[PDB]
Amino acid sequence: LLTTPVLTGVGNDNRWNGQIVGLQPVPGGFSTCNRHWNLNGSTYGWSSPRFADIDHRRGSASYPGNNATNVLQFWYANAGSAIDNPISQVAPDGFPDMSFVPFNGPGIPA
Amino acid sequence: SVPGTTTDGMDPGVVATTSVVTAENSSASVATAGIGGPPQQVDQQETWRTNFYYNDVFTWSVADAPGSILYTVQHSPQNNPFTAVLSQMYAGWAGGMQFRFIVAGSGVFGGRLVAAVIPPGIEIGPGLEVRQFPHVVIDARSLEPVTITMPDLRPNMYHPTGDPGLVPTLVLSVYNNLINPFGGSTSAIQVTVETRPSEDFEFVMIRAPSSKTVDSISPAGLLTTPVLTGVGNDNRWNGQIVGLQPVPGGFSTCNRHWNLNGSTYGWSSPRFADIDHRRGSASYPGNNATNVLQFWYANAGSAIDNPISQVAPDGFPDMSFVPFNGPGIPAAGWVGFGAIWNSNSGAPNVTTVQAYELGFATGAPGNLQPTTNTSGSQTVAKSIYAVVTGTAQNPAGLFVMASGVISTPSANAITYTPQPDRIVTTPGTPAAAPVGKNTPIMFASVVRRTGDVNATAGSANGTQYGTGSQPLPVTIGLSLNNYSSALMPGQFFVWQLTFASGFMEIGLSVDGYFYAGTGASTTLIDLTELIDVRPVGPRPSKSTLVFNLG
Amino acid sequence: TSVVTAENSSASIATAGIGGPPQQVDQQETWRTNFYYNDVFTWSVADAPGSILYTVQHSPQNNPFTAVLSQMYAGWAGGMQFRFIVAGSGVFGGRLVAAVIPPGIEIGPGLEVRQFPHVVIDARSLEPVTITMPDLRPNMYHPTGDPGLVPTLVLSVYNNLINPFGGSTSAIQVTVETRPSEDFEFVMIRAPSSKTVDSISPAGLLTTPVLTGVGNDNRWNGQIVGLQPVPGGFSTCNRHWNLNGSTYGWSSPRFADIDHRRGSASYPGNNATNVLQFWYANAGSAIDNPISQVAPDGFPDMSFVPFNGPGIPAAGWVGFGAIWNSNSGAPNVTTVQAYELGFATGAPGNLQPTTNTSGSQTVAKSIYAVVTGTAQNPAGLFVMASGVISTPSANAITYTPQPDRIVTTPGTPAAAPVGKNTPIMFASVVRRTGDVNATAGSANGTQYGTGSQPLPVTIGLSLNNYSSALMPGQFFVWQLTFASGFMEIGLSVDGYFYAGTGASTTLIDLTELIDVRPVGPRPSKSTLVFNLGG
């Protein structure tokens, strides 16, 4: 499963679909759930092992303010409701496992 | 000597050994199996172990592609009738067995078969190529029988009856296609299998007769002859089953369904008692509370008192709500006699006892829409007749009888209820898929209707058939016993119903669904002349079940 | 270990050669060398000397392993060895005799077992006593299917049992064990799927979950949670099937619907607003029911309660239903209510409860107000078979129905106490109208609805015939195991259930019940045990 071209020039990573260049040590520890498989043929996440479109329906859409030119767009939906995956219904297939950094106004988030 | 066309009961015929019958296998099998004590039932003069006795039969068609399996058995004492009788009073076995094949063909046909013995660790599946194992090829024009011996290759010292472990498997498949040079109507032949224990077979530990085991008994005892032609009801209504009808495409009904493993598909423990709730809003349209239609709804997740799942109350019908407005009664659907009752140690209201239509709505109390998914929905009920008093309190509940009827305006032909496009689906289910020519089957019965009280099976307009998934005696027989090892996934347990002019075979997979070889027909098969039921065994899903009806 | 052979063994081997060579004859087999359990019986302090306590015929069914092996052989011959183990105590006294009776002699009260060749068994013996029964037959072998003449082993009382200590304990259990003799054999192997005619037994109808899981009664589809005894007797015949393939009454066992077509309808009051609808028809007009003409299927078998005004009557049978006209009828929109069903007489004048079916008349009076009231002569009822019980206030009234309130037909047998045994009556948790949330917790006791037998049993017994499975004068007996006690239950030939509780009216809860186990047919003079945790 781990050969020489996998870590040299062919393999990608399971979060960003990008070329693996290095190794990053984490001395504290972490837990990754989405698109992650154990040695039992099982997953706890909500994504298949492939990179495709994220599609969901039945979610409330709104926009702040009153003027409708150059206005930020908002959309949300609850967890546990997305009936599109045979795996689990926590989130639709392909949703990133990152916490939402809050922002508003003319500032690009970090 | 006998001239080849008559055969004795102790005559094997020709002997075919592939590569696994060796002297060291038998010498290691005899010497190591002495850990159970002295061997029992070992006497090479008894009648039960000198003759061949009947085990099985199967058919070989012209349209069978090369590489398709016609016969498979695991190594077991269930492959001979007398060792199956003797295994109830012993707790261990070792040794091999012999299999005699007689082809009932003529010298004008063509085609070959192939047989092999598979080692214990290999998975028996789609990617198994048995022609790349040591094998033996049998012609279709053979007159004398052919005997194949399967030895005992095991990593343990003996086979406990409740836990044998790893066993070999005998596979028989098509080598070359069957050819009839005249063509026409004759396109199949039959092969009969006999069995006989080998010389190194024995039992060890005496135990008690009909002792319980850590494994599981075969699922043949639950489906007997009074279940079909007598007592036995549906999963949604308590009515006797009358007929058998196929569906094209498949369905998914997941209310009171139990798998082969002991597990339920959500709520609704299997007993037709009642429906009760303690939280839920009540309202009524219009400015006047006189001759109105009551409106109760609550979200999915408010069923605290249900001990299985929180999504729905116990005994609720799994029907999508058909939206209706006005005095015109809805078509089909589920309607039951009920009333309302208030919370905080409250008596039921006297003035409102009426039949309500039950279902799941979307977007209540505004525009109500039918729904297919149970997650993120809200259960609902509204009356079909006019009541004289309405309640508008936030804490309220229901009291509905579990037995129900169908509501129809016209009631001449309608449609069998429910349809596969109407049955709701809980998260986490496997759906029915028609494999081979076999189709999913749903049991039919007779349920009364609101449009006509006298719904008798006879004249005065044709009768209406309600469809339920599995019988209630069958669901009781699976709610306790676990069958993880009784039937391997990938095949089904097949019975053999016998009518007065024909016979059909019905199956039961690991998913709890029933299969029949109906093909592309939607004809109701009335079960009135059915006499007896005899079980058969585990058969692969690619094989076709017979449909001899007169 | 020594194996005992019979006195007639050399003539027994030779004359059985008409069936071929002997089968399953290997003297080192483990199923043949050890003793295994067969049966159990009771020796009482009230048994007169010369009374018979145990009787068994020569058969290959008095052993757990020869009964399995007889499924694949059409014939048997040879002897069989018996062993007796007394539970006993060192403070008891009395002896017993056991002898083998040849064919042609009666087994009865005039049999003098003490002048046959016998063995003596002590009431305080620790080591077991052994006796061998030979195969004394007038045939060459015994074919399975029609054996012939066999000897019989008879156990009798020599000296009566004595307890000088006093009260409490007055009965001893004796266990029988069996291994075959050296000369026993089988002949002529056969198909195991062949004649499946094996002593049909009413043991598989009452299993474990039936009482600690699924399982309902004949009045309601409610879970059976407790048994309640009643001293004196009762009579019920609605869904009550006896051990033959017959019953006395209507209502085949399914809680589907209650449907009738013809019957008069009326209502009191000169105003057609907020009244109680009253439907009534006489007994004998149920043409659509193929079983009995007395009542439609699903009608309750309790009497009417005479009430008037806006007060909800105590107890009874209330069910959610409606009225419907005839002539390919659709039901009326504006009348769906809870209706109280029962048997009465003298309607629509003085409504009185009645005991007997004959001379009575079925009635249906609504308990809640309905806005419209019809008066058409052809009318019927479409009521769900599952219902509740009406109550004025929540409280806890009593178990319903009472044994005097049950309506029975002419020609019905009655349950009667025999000895200390008392007929019991299965109970269940049900809902009511005085309090919808009938949780089995706090806020007073819950309502109990009581029926005759477990509906499951009726379902499994209505197919088969049990005429020779239980000899008359006995019960088929089970042994219920609790966590800190055990009990014993009976089933008569007439369809009733008994327990040896005596004259007590305390409910027994099936909460810590673990499993059940069949015992067999036992005489009714023996008291069933009541060693409960209290």
Residue with tokens 């190529």: B129
Q: How does strand B14-16 pair with strand B146-150? A: parallel
Q: Is the dihedral of CA C56, C61, C64, C66 positive or negative?
A: positive
- Label residue C167 exposed, middle or buried (CB < 10 Å: 0-12, 13-18, 19+): exposed
Task: Give the CA count within 13 Å in the CB-facing half-sphere of C59.
Answer: 16
Retrieve residue C103's tokens.
């064919």
CB of A83 less than 8 A from some CB of B: yes
Eight-state DSSP code of residue C446:
P
DSSP B221-272: SSS-GGGTSSS---SSS---EEEEEE-SS-----SS-B-SSS-BSSS--S--
Spatial contact of B549 and B502, defined as CB atoms under 8 Å apart? yes
Cα–Cα distance measured from residue C436 to residue B343, given in angstroms and rounded to the nearest whole number: 9
The CB density around residue B286, as the number of other CB atoms within 10 Å, is 10
- Label residue C228 exposed, middle or buried (CB < 10 Å: 0-12, 13-18, 19+): middle
Spatial contact of C461 and C410, defined as CB atoms under 8 Å apart? no
Q: Is the dihedral of CA C407, C412, C416, C421 positive or negative?
A: negative
Q: Which residues of C touch B340 (CB under 8 A)?
A: none
Spatial contact of B195 and B100, defined as CB atoms under 8 Å apart? yes
Residue with tokens 């759930």: A33
Cα–Cα distance measured from residue B95 to residue B158, given in angstroms and rounded to the nearest whole number: 9
Helix or strand (DSSP H, E) at A4 = helix A4-5
Cα–Cα distance measured from residue B251 to residue B431, given in angstroms and rounded to the nearest whole number: 7
Spatial contact of B402 and B324, defined as CB atoms under 8 Å apart? no
Give per-residue burial for C283-294: e unless 16+ CB within 10 Å, then b. Answer: bebbeebeebeb
Spatial contact of C497 and C451, defined as CB atoms under 8 Å apart? no
Cα–Cα distance measured from residue C255 to residue C220, given in angstroms and rounded to the nearest whole number: 8
Distance from the Cα of C226 to chain B's closest Cα (Å) equals 17
Residue with tokens 């053999």: B496
Q: Which residues contact A35 (CB under 8 A, 6 or more apart)?
A: A14, A15, A43, A45, A47, A48, A49, A97
Q: List subunits contacting chain B, requiring 3 or more Cβ pairs under 8 Å.
A: A, C
DSSP B335-353: EEEEEEEETTT-PEEEEEE
CB of B263 less than 8 A from some CB of A: no
Give per-residue burial for C96-125: e unless 16+ CB within 10 Å, then b. Answer: bbbbbbeeeeeeeeebebeeeebeebbbee
Q: How far is CA B254 from the centre of its chain?
A: 15
Resolution (A): 2.5
Spatial contact of B153 and B115, defined as CB atoms under 8 Å apart? no
Cα–Cα distance measured from residue B487 to residue B510, given in angstroms and rounded to the nearest whole number: 7
DSSP C256-289: S-EE----EEE--SSSSSSB--EEEEETT---S-
Distance from the Cα of A80 to chain B's closest Cα (Å) equals 8
Nearest-Cα residue of chain B relative to residue C255: B238
Residue B521 φ then ψ, to 5° = -140, 145
Which SS3 state, helix, strand or coil, does residue C429 take?
strand
Task: Give the CA count within 13 Å in the CB-facing half-sphere of C178.
Answer: 22
Length of chain B, please? 550
Helix or strand (DSSP H, E) at B466 = strand B465-468
Q: Nearest CA to C313 among C353, C360, C274, C358? A: C353
Helix segments in B419-510, DSSP class H: 472-479
User: Does C443 contact B46 at a Cβ distance shorter than 8 Å?
Assistant: no
Cα–Cα distance measured from residue C212 to residue C511, given in angstroms and rounded to the nearest whole number: 7
Cα–Cα distance measured from residue A44 to residue A36, given in angstroms and rounded to the nearest whole number: 7
Top residue of C31, C225, C289 to mutate, by most chain B CBs within 10 Å, is C31
Spatial contact of C190 and C74, defined as CB atoms under 8 Å apart? yes
User: Does B40 contact C24 at a Cβ distance shorter than 8 Å?
Assistant: no
Q: Is the dihedral of CA A15, A16, A22, A25 positive or negative?
A: negative
Residue B87 φ then ψ, to 5° = -75, -15
Retrieve residue C217's tokens.
């009664």
Distance from the Cα of B141 to chain C's closest Cα (Å) equals 30
Cα–Cα distance measured from residue B512 to residue B257, given in angstroms and rounded to the nearest whole number: 7
Cα–Cα distance measured from residue C251 to residue B46, given in angstroms and rounded to the nearest whole number: 55
Retrieve residue C255's tokens.
């809680």
Retrieve residue B165's tokens.
């472990």
Q: Is the dihedral of CA B412, B418, B421, B424 positive or negative?
A: positive
Spatial contact of B380 and B366, defined as CB atoms under 8 Å apart? no
Cα–Cα distance measured from residue A91 to residue C375, given in angstroms and rounded to the nearest whole number: 61
Residue C299 φ then ψ, to 5° = -75, 140
- Label residue B202 exposed, middle or buried (CB < 10 Å: 0-12, 13-18, 19+): buried
Cα–Cα distance measured from residue B89 to residue B95, given in angstroms and rounded to the nearest whole number: 18
The CB density around residue C496, as the number of other CB atoms within 10 Å, is 24
Residue with tokens 């058919």: B59
Retrieve residue C93's tokens.
């006294």
Top residue of B454, B533, B534 to mutate, by most chain C CBs within 10 Å, is B454
Cα–Cα distance measured from residue C199 to residue B425, given in angstroms and rounded to the nearest whole number: 47
Eight-state DSSP code of residue C309:
T
Cα–Cα distance measured from residue C179 to residue C157, given in angstroms and rounded to the nearest whole number: 24
Residue C432 φ then ψ, to 5° = -135, 175
Task: Give the CA count within 13 Å in the CB-facing half-sphere of C90.
Answer: 0
Retrieve residue C1's tokens.
């270990």
Cα–Cα distance measured from residue B242 to residue B239, given in angstroms and rounded to the nearest whole number: 9
User: CB-CB: which of C189, C191, C434 is closest to B347?
Assistant: C434
User: At CA B340, angle to CA B337 and CA B346, rounded to 5?
Assistant: 140
Answer left, alpha or beta for residue C121, where phi above 0 means left and psi between -120 and 50 means alpha.
beta
Cα–Cα distance measured from residue C180 to residue C197, given in angstroms and rounded to the nearest whole number: 23
Q: Which residues contact B354 (CB under 8 A, 6 or more apart)?
A: B294, B337, B338, B339, B383, B384, B385, B387, C336, C337
Which SS3 state, helix, strand or coil, does residue B15 take?
strand
At B57, which amino acid appears? V
Length of chain C, please? 534
User: Does B448 contact C331 at a Cβ distance shorter than 8 Å?
Assistant: no
What's the per-residue H, E or C state across B141-182? CCCCCEEEEECCCCCCCCECCCCCCCCCEEEEEEEEEEECCC
Paired residues of C302 in beta bridges:
C406
Cα–Cα distance measured from residue C35 to residue C63, given in angstroms and rounded to the nearest whole number: 9
Q: Which residues of A touch B375 (CB under 8 A)?
A: 80-81, 83, 89
User: What was the structure determination method?
Assistant: cryo-EM
Cis previous bond, B418, omega within 30:
yes
Q: Which residues contact C474 (CB under 8 A, 6 or more apart)?
A: C493, C521, C522, C523, C524
Q: Do chains A and B touch (3 or more CB pairs under 8 A)?
A: yes
Q: How does strand A74-76 pair with strand B348-361? A: unpaired
